[PDB]
């Protein structure tokens, strides 16, 4: 029915599914709570607009990572907000230091969190080629399970989509200390 292993793309309903699972397997990740500061999208539940993780350490530095849903590319899109140890907001050229050079120059931009009425500067990873990446990563995971089994139902389910997405993001943000381990 779903073509997500074929397209690397998710629907809004599937985004919510993968988010719930991510929030379950890793409770450091939480859905947004309802707030008047939030610019709501009609195509998502009010309490399931975007995913938040708080103060992930770097190097000191700390990051709030946000996972929103890109409607144009039907993929998740990430936003990072950095802070110094004293809690002072980091600067765009500081935040660029914590992003892989090659991937930084090609995908990263500075913009406010689009889901907040109140302006909060962040670094935006453009999701232009996320679908192609996920398409490859999901099938690669499948091969690993295929080899592990050999000692078809090895393909992942869609609510596991975001964990694969985060494993991808972690590689692009190495200094940010978060990792996602399964099996």
Please give the positions annotated as active site: 128
Residue 83 to residue 87: CA distance in whole angstroms: 5
CB 65 within 8 A of CB 183: no
**Tokens standing for 116?**
């907040």
Cα separations (Å) of 99 from 63, 78, 82, 145, 175? 12, 12, 11, 30, 8
DSSP label of 71: T
Residue bearing tokens 């849903």: 69
* CB-count exposure of residue 48 (10 Å: 0-12, 13-18, 19+): middle
C-beta neighbour count of 105 within 10 angstroms: 10
CB 108 within 8 A of CB 124: yes
- DSSP code for 106: H
| Pairing verdict, β 108-112 and 121-125 | antiparallel
């Amino acid at each position: 029915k779903s073509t997500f292993l074929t397209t690397g793309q998710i629907t809004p309903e599937e985004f919510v599914q993968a988010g719930d699972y991510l929030a379950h397997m890793f409770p450091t990740w939480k859905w947004n709570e309802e707030s008047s500061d939030i610019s709501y999208r009609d195509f998502l539940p009010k309490n399931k607009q975007f995913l938040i993780i708080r103060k992930v350490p770097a190097d000191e530095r700390y990051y709030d990572l946000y996972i929103a849903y890109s409607t144009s590319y039907r993929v998740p899109k990430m936003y990072i907000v950095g802070f110094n140890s004293n809690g002072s907001p980091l600067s765009p050229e500081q935040m660029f230091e914590d992003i892989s050079a090659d991937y930084r120059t090609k995908t990263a931009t500075i913009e406010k969190l689009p889901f907040y009425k109140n302006s909060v500067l962040s670094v935006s990873i453009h999701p232009c080629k996320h679908a192609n990446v996920m398409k490859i990563l999901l099938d690669k995971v499948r091969v690993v399970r295929q080899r592990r089994r050999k000692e078809i139902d090895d393909s992942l389910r869609v609510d596991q989509y975001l964990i694969v997405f985060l494993k991808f993001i972690t590689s692009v943000t190495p200094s940010i200390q978060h990792d996602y381990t399964m099996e």
